[PDB]
Amino acid sequence: AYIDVECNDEAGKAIYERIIQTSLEDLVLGKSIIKAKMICKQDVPYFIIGILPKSKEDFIDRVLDFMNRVFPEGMRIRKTIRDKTIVMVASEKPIEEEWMNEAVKLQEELKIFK
Amino acid sequence: EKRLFLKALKEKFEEDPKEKYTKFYTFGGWEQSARKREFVEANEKIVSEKRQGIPLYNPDIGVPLGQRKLMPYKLSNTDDYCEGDDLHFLNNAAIQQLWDDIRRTVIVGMDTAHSVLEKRLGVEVTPETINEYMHTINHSLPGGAVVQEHMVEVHPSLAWDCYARIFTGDDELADELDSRFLIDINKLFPEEQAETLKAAIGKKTYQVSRVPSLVGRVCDGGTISRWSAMQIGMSFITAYKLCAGEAATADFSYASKHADVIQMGNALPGRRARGPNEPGGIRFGILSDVVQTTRVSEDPVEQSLEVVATGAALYDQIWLGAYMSGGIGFTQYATASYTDDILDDFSYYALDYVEKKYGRMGTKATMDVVEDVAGEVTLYALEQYDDYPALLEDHFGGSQRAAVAAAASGIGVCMATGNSNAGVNGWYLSQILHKEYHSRLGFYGYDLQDQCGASNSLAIRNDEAAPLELRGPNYPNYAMNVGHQGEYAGIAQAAHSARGDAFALNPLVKVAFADPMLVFDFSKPRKEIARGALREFEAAGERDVILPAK
Amino acid sequence: LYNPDIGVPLGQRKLMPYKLSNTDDYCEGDDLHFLNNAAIQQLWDDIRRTVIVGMDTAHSVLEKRLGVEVTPETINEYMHTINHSLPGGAVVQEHMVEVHPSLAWDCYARIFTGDDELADELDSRFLIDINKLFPEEQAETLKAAIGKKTYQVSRVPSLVGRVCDGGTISRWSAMQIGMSFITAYKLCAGEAATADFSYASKHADVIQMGNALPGRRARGPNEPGGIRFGILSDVVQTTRVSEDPVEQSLEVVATGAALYDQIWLGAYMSGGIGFTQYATASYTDDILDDFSYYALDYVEKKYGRMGTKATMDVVEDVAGEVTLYALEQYDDYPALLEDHFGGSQRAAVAAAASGIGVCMATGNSNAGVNGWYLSQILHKEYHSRLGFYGYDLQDQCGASNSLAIRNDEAAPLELRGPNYPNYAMNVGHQGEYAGIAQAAHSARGDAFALNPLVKVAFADPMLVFDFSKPRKEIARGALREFEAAGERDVILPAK
Amino acid sequence: IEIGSYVRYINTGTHGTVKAIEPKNDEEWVLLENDIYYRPELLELVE
Amino acid sequence: RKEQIVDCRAVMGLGEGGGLAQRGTFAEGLRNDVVVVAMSPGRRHITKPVCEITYGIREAGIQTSVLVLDAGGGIPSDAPQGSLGSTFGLKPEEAKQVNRHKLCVIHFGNVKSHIIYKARLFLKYVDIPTIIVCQTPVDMEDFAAIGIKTKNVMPLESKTEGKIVEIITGVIRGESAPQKKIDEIIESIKKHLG
Ligand code: F43
Ligand code: F43
Ligand SMILES: C[C@@H](OP(=O)(O)O)[C@H](NC(=O)/C=C/CCCCSSCCS(=O)(=O)O)C(=O)O
Numbered sequence A: 001a002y003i004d005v006e007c008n009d010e011a012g013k014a015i016y017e018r019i020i021q022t023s024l025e026d027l028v029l030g031k032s033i034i035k036a037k038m039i040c041k042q043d044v045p046y047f048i049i050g051i052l053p054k055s056k057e058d059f060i061d062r063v064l065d066f067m068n069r070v071f072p073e074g075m076r077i078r079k080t081i082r083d084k085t086i087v088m089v090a091s092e093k094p095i096e097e098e099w100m101n102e103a104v105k106l107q108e109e110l111k112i113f114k
Numbered sequence B: 001e002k003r004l005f006l007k008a009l010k011e012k013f014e015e016d017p018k019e020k021y022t023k024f025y026t027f028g029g030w031e032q033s034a035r036k037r038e039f040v041e042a043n044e045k046i047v048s049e050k051r052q053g054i055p056l057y058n059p060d061i062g063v064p065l066g067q068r069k070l071m072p073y074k075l076s077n078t079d080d081y082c083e084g085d086d087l088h089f090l091n092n093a094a095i096q097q098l099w100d101d102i103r104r105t106v107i108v109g110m111d112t113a114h115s116v117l118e119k120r121l122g123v124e125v126t127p128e129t130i131n132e133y134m135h136t137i138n139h140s141l142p143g144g145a146v147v148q149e150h151m152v153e154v155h156p157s158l159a160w161d162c163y164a165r166i167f168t169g170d171d172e173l174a175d176e177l178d179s180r181f182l183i184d185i186n187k188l189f190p191e192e193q194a195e196t197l198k199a200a201i202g203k204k205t206y207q208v209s210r211v212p213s214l215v216g217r218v219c220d221g222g223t224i225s226r227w228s229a230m231q232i233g234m235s236f237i238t239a240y241k242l243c244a245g246e247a248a249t250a251d252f253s254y255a256s257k258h259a260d261v262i263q264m265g266n267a268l269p270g271r272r273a274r275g276p277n278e279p280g281g282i283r284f285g286i287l288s289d290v291v292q293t294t295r296v297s298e299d300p301v302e303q304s305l306e307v308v309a310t311g312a313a314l315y316d317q318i319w320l321g322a323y324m325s326g327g328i329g330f331t332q333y334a335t336a337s338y339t340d341d342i343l344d345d346f347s348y349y350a351l352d353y354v355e356k357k358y359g360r361m362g363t364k365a366t367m368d369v370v371e372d373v374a375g376e377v378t379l380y381a382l383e384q385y386d387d388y389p390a391l392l393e394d395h396f397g398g399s400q401r402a403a404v405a406a407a408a409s410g411i412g413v414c415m416a417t418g419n420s421n422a423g424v425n426g427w428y429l430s431q432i433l434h435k436e437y438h439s440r441l442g443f444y445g446y447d448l449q450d451q452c453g454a455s456n457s458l459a460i461r462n463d464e465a466a467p468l469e470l471r472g473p474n475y476p477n478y479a480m481n482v483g484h485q486g487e488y489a490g491i492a493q494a495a496h497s498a499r500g501d502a503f504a505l506n507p508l509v510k511v512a513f514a515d516p517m518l519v520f521d522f523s524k525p526r527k528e529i530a531r532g533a534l535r536e537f538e539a540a541g542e543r544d545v546i547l548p549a550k
Numbered sequence C: 001l002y003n004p005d006i007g008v009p010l011g012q013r014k015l016m017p018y019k020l021s022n023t024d025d026y027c028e029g030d031d032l033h034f035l036n037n038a039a040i041q042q043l044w045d046d047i048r049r050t051v052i053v054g055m056d057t058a059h060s061v062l063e064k065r066l067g068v069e070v071t072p073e074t075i076n077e078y079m080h081t082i083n084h085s086l087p088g089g090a091v092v093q094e095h096m097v098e099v100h101p102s103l104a105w106d107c108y109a110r111i112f113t114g115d116d117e118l119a120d121e122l123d124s125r126f127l128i129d130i131n132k133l134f135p136e137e138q139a140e141t142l143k144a145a146i147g148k149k150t151y152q153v154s155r156v157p158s159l160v161g162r163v164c165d166g167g168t169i170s171r172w173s174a175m176q177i178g179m180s181f182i183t184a185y186k187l188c189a190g191e192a193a194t195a196d197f198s199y200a201s202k203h204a205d206v207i208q209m210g211n212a213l214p215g216r217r218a219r220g221p222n223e224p225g226g227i228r229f230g231i232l233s234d235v236v237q238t239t240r241v242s243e244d245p246v247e248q249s250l251e252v253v254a255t256g257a258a259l260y261d262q263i264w265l266g267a268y269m270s271g272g273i274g275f276t277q278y279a280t281a282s283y284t285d286d287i288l289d290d291f292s293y294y295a296l297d298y299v300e301k302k303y304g305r306m307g308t309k310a311t312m313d314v315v316e317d318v319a320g321e322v323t324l325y326a327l328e329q330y331d332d333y334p335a336l337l338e339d340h341f342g343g344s345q346r347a348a349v350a351a352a353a354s355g356i357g358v359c360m361a362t363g364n365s366n367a368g369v370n371g372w373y374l375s376q377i378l379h380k381e382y383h384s385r386l387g388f389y390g391y392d393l394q395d396q397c398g399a400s401n402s403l404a405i406r407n408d409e410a411a412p413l414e415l416r417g418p419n420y421p422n423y424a425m426n427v428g429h430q431g432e433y434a435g436i437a438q439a440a441h442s443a444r445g446d447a448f449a450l451n452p453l454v455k456v457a458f459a460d461p462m463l464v465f466d467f468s469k470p471r472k473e474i475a476r477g478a479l480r481e482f483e484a485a486g487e488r489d490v491i492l493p494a495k
Numbered sequence D: 001i002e003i004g005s006y007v008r009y010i011n012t013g014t015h016g017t018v019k020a021i022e023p024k025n026d027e028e029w030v031l032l033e034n035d036i037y038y039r040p041e042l043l044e045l046v047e
Numbered sequence E: 001r002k003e004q005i006v007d008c009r010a011v012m013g014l015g016e017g018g019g020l021a022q023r024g025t026f027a028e029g030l031r032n033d034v035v036v037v038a039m040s041p042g043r044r045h046i047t048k049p050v051c052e053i054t055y056g057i058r059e060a061g062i063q064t065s066v067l068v069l070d071a072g073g074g075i076p077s078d079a080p081q082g083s084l085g086s087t088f089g090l091k092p093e094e095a096k097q098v099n100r101h102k103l104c105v106i107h108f109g110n111v112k113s114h115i116i117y118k119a120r121l122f123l124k125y126v127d128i129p130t131i132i133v134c135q136t137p138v139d140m141e142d143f144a145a146i147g148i149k150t151k152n153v154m155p156l157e158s159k160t161e162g163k164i165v166e167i168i169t170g171v172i173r174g175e176s177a178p179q180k181k182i183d184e185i186i187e188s189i190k191k192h193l194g
């Protein structure tokens, strides 16, 4: 799969890229997913992970397992949007609308990825 | 007039199938095909990322592709269309799994092993012990090591397609065995077919070993028999605990894994040097027995045409276009025999003519019936090509036309007489009549075996004589050229579909490939190829669990 | 007090990770199985899918029969064409289907030449540069051996050799070469000169990795049973990146073990568990490295790297000294003995060290195998055990067959292989034989062992498997960080 | 379900004849010919 | 949400690049609720299917101990015609360490005949309800065929004092257990514990 992380922290970028790769390998999800992009915002605690699958409910369950594995533990408030591109926003605070807008922007960017 | 191929021609061609004129050079080249555009986008991404700028796919060199309308392909008796690129054996996982399932199958009889265990080794053999042995071999065949944690074992998820199954013609033993790993002849076959197969098999017990696909991918086809034998020996000495010496163990080993072994194909000599279980060693009768449409269909034409489709996909595509030539391949020739209902229409006409004139099997094989049936079917097929210009555009190569017409003629003759050599004789007469009709035939060396055929069809000489069931890709006339062997297998099957036979050459192969645990279901090869062409076929042999995700 | 339900703990050593010689990576023993290691599979795939074709007879046909002029620009155009045609693109015959480029991203057609003037005006994209990839002296030696000849290296996709067998590769390359020739020079699609091209590329100028084994063996070409020991020595590329003769011989030993003993013997001619601990014994811990370095130190202290000519006395001296040292090391350190618990492992390691020492003393490979066999029959008397019964078949007839001149028994160790009649069945011998053959030339500082074309062809940087450091790549594959070709995920549904 | 009947275990299909019913711990149990207790809810009558 | 303190083992792991646990060792999770029993510290058992169950339980809020058996590989000596390859057993100290927990979770392999006899020998000395986590589909009656106390299929002549309380199938050795299996195990533990 394609893995890229948008973070201003140098160590966080590489470490979470490795975490994403490992979580994909553990669930055997590498060949079933086209792209996996994660946006890290730690100053205001919230993270966004987008998934563009290749081309059922079991695959979706595996994808939410991947989100649960990758996301930091403290971010327990999560909501997801699924319209052939699964995007989830995780934060320790109730989700704000701007974060959802960023999520849909990531979703549309992932859709046109080719 | 109503023809079975009319609907496909309506779908493929925008103009009337009887219309003699069209226009070209207005489709934009390769851009008219979604597959080619996907290939271009991929090639760009791969070149930039993995190839470090070394070009891979350049449509701008060579022929300007797409000067004409690139037609889509139906699949006979299936209502789904696909591009021609999806039917390439490398782009189609269904064809790859079709070859994988045949390659990784070995049938071993376990009656000498049981007799040696009972008498020489002094160990009792009971259905409970057989169940224990089946458990042991099912754990050990893929990669397992019995009660030895210190031994290296293959990852279990890497061999999810590996099974060990058992079947027997003994009814009481069959119902005393565990149904988890039993191929039940009674519930898989109709009553009369099951009775015939049980009578042919006898009161003997056989085990089928499906080596994992990955083993055949990494290694060759000759690895399968050795893998099966080694695992069978280990499981036999692990399940049954024996206190006899080591020499008695050698006798038991011979009895258990070197006595009643049935392989799919034989080794090939000369420049075709190959091991066993390669597609060039599979006889036509064996391939007819591999296909299981006699189980689920009473139509003789459909039974012959499924074998034709499987034989085309194996012999013409995999064997000839890769094992023997390589490159883009000979997909064209094989798809011509199973894409549209052209061969279906021709074979149905041949069956109707035979039924109206001679009866279903109402004549003994004589020269006159061969000549008249083959001539009538060939003339019908050629005039069908003549009066439907879209049909001639669909089968643009001469070979694909010749093979289809000759296959129809041979199937008709086999229907009339029930003799496979008479059917092949009709095939050859059809070929030369086609040549005189259209002043044309296949490519440069298409009719090497069609000029030599008439004399070799009923010959009795050493290197020329063989029943068509016992012939195959290593038959000297059939060794090289494309567009024959799959149709030969279909004709061999049609020789027995006329008689309503339960099998053609080997009952054990038929029962073994009736197994529901196979990845490729041989009951409907055309449907599975259609599924593979749509990227909806789950093939085995993928090393997903030992590779990085990035 | 005797409680029969306590049980017996077992296999403590096998639970511990296996280091890899000359690396710093620790891996489990389960990850070194050839089925569980994608690096070993890619090693075999890269060797299998390689065919070298001499594109000089074809040029002569184009010049003298078809009256076509061949210039470096035409060769560049031809290379552009074949890099598109070999993976499965269409060049002539309107209306073809094509293979997916995603499945053939590892397919390359490369060109190398010993002619520097022609290599100068050649597109560096398709050129295997001998000057850039090899040191000056090695480059000069390779060019002198190759001569002013042009060769084409075709690497057909790994998927082709995985679906089919190894006999497919030469035919695939020949068809695509003929197609690219007729479409790059604007020739008739089929005439007598086309047959000349086809014959040249099919057998006259083709170089196969492995010969066919017709008859009893029943196997096609480009199978691991047909690869001679010198060919595998030339496949390994440590000679051009390192100057340590022991390191080169040991990398060849590792590659030979992983190919022959694991793949060929434990799968092609056996099955199931295979022989993983028989082969990893030669490249996991530095045991073989320590023994080989002791052998080199002893030889350089009393003989020199080539200070003596191969005689019986030097063979006895070196092989006996190294065998005694290795067995003393096994006695002194119980960790070494429990690491190589099986007698076959120990016998192979000690004999490999002795043969490498003899080769470093004399520079002769047959003297190396003679030393190996002396080491085996001395190990037998030292410990009163050799290995599993059935192991010392070739070791008993070895001494007589090592210097034999009879038809069925004579062959230089570079020309020997798994199809040599004595070597055809037993594990624990062949990879070490390849290492001894390599050590015969590492002593002399040779650029190659048997075939310069194979060495240059496998010096290509675009190969999926890095043959400069085979043990590092095996370790990477064991750690699930090696990317292998031949996978078909673009044509498969999402799981 | 009674003594002498024919029952089969739904999970595996083992056939046997009911030998006795031996309640224990305020819970019904069914003993088959193989001297193995079963549960009535996991057993059903066949004919 | 409460603090969870584990008594790490007193001995180190298997070499440098090897596993973190050691054979025949115990790691008490203070408050004894669940003990996860691993047949060996090897890659086939440790951190791939066992530490995953451990962190699933520890995420559910239930303290967990992990015990690695000294001899967990093989079949017991009481198996028909004895054992082969290796001998399975349970030490009295291991039994005492298990028996102070409310519940036990034990991970088994593929072969049914091995699992049944291993469970019988294990429950000959363990008196708390246990959960069998194996790969093969094994029915909750074949254990009773050889005498094991079982929640649904009791034996006439019980040869064990422990009750197989649940059997969970589909967990492969050496492979990451999906969240669905962890959820099933947690639900079974919660409903069979309190
Ligand atoms: C160059 C050759 C010589 C040869 O050995 N093979 C060729 C070309 C080869 C290449 C095509 C390379 C590419 O895509 O550019 C391959 C794929 C063999 C290979 N593995 O490389 C092939 N043909 Ni041919 N080839 C075919 C056919 C044909 C029919 C085309 C009929 C017509 O319209 O004239 C004719 C034979 C004829 O003499 O009639 C034919 C010829 C020829 N065929 C003549 C001349 C082609 C020309 O147009 O200049 N193929 C067909 O009849 C359909 C099947 C098709 C095969 C691929 C597939 O199945 O998709 C393909 C099979
Ligand atoms: C367990 C057996 C039974 C048998 O028929 N062969 C075995 C087992 C077999 C199986 C193991 C899998 C399994 O499920 O049994 C295979 C893989 C057979 C094969 N296909 O090559 C094997 N041994 Ni063995 N076997 C080995 C070895 C050994 C060493 C072990 C020495 C010791 O004292 O511990 C000895 C041979 C000898 O005595 O010299 C040995 C014996 C034995 N080996 C005897 C011993 C008991 C018997 O009397 O029945 N192996 C070794 O020396 C290491 C390499 C190892 C091979 C697999 C690997 O390479 O990974 C394996 C190779
Ligand atoms: C193909 C086969 O030929 P053959 O069995 O007909 O000689 C040949 N195998 C052998 O020669 C023998 C196979 C046994 C495997 C090696 C044993 S290692 S572990 C067994 C130790 S022992 O107890 O058997 O001595 C091979 O090339 O693998």
Ligand SMILES: O=S(=O)(O)CCS
Binding pocket: B443, B444, B445, C190
């Ligand atoms: O036309 S040829 O006979 O050369 C080959 C047809 S693909």
